[PDB]
């Protein structure tokens, strides 16, 4: 019962890139994270490089211009705004983390799946196997799956 996008075509734009990973791997992690949610909804996501994207993806540090300051390495990993204009939908990742493609540091793909869930209107889950559980855990991204609770939540908002 959060806000929802009132359309099924949603654009995203990567505002800037963490130096922790190469550009190609950031693009891949974000694209695959959107695909997790498009696989179970009517939503489609396209990446744009200019113009007026719905979901801006940002890496930033500490106090970074909104009311949700980051805390250095550890603790908060990222945060995201629910659907809406302007800053609505945007997903912010704490650059004081070490973002990775793998099990070390903080896995960008898994964090992005969680944050995009918020960007689409989801809240938190009580299921410890749900990607929308409040605290991060690494799972083999090659075999990652949304939990049945995640699919229930997002199918209740769209379709
Ligand atoms: N507290 C913790 O365990 C870690 C600490 C990291 C550290 O200090 O080293 N930090 C977090 O989990 C933070 C802060 C939590 C808090 O203090 O309340 N959590 C976040 O940053 C989330 C913020 C938000 O709600 O948007 C972001 C988040 C959650 C996840 C996540 C990823 C995978 C899973 C998961 C779990 C089980 C199975 C599967 Cl498939 C997936 C669950 C959650 N990724 O990013
Ligand atoms: Ca942090
Ligand atoms: Ca936005
Ligand atoms: Ca970093
Ligand atoms: Zn922010
Ligand atoms: Zn969350």
Swiss-Prot record:
The keyword Protease applies. GO terms for biological process: bronchiole development; cellular response to virus; collagen catabolic process; elastin catabolic process; extracellular matrix disassembly; extracellular matrix organization; lung alveolus development; negative regulation of endothelial cell-matrix adhesion via fibronectin. Its main location: secreted. GO terms for molecular function: calcium ion binding; collagen binding; core promoter sequence-specific DNA binding; endopeptidase activity; metalloendopeptidase activity; sequence-specific DNA binding; serine-type endopeptidase activity; zinc ion binding. The keyword Phosphoprotein does not apply. Found in alveolar macrophages but not in peripheral blood monocytes. One of its GO terms (cellular component) is cytoplasm. Keywords: Calcium, Disulfide bond, Extracellular matrix, Glycoprotein, Hydrolase, Metal-binding, Metalloprotease, Protease, Repeat, Secreted, Signal, Zinc, Zymogen. It is found in: Secreted, Extracellular space, Extracellular matrix. Ca(2+) 1 binds at residues 20, 95, 97. Induction: By exposure to bacterial lipopolysaccharides (LPS). Inhibited by dexamethasone. The active site is at 115. Ca(2+) 2 binds at residues 54, 86, 88, 90. Ca(2+) 3 binds at residues 71-72, 74, 76, 94, 97. Belongs to the peptidase M10A family. May be involved in tissue injury and remodeling. Has significant elastolytic activity. Can accept large and small amino acids at the P1' site, but has a preference for leucine. Aromatic or hydrophobic residues are preferred at the P1 site, with small hydrophobic residues (preferably alanine) occupying P3. The conserved cysteine present in the cysteine-switch motif binds the catalytic zinc ion, thus inhibiting the enzyme. The dissociation of the cysteine from the zinc ion upon the activation-peptide release activates the enzyme. This is Macrophage metalloelastase. It comes from Homo sapiens. The gene is MMP12. The chain holds residues 106 to 263 of 470 of the full protein.
């Amino acid at each position: 019962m959060g806000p929802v996008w009132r359309k099924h075509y949603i654009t995203y734009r990567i505002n800037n890139y963490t130096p922790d990973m190469n550009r190609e791997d950031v693009d891949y992690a974000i694209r695959k994270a959107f695909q997790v949610w498009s696989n179970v909804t009517p939503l489609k996501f396209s990446k744009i490089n200019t113009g007026m994207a719905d979901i801006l993806v940002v890496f930033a540090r500490g106090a970074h211009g909104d009311d949700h300051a980051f805390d250095g390495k550890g603790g908060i990993l990222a945060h995201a705004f629910g659907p809406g204009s302007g800053i609505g939908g945007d997903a912010h990742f704490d650059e004081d983390e070490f973002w990775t493609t793998h099990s070390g540091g903080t896995n960008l793909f898994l964090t992005a799946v969680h944050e995009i869930g918020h960007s689409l209107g989801l809240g938190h889950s009580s299921d410890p196997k749900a990607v929308m559980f409040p605290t991060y855990a690494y799972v083999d991204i090659n075999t990652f799956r949304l939990s049945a609770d995640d699919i229930r939540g997002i199918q209740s908002l769209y379709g």
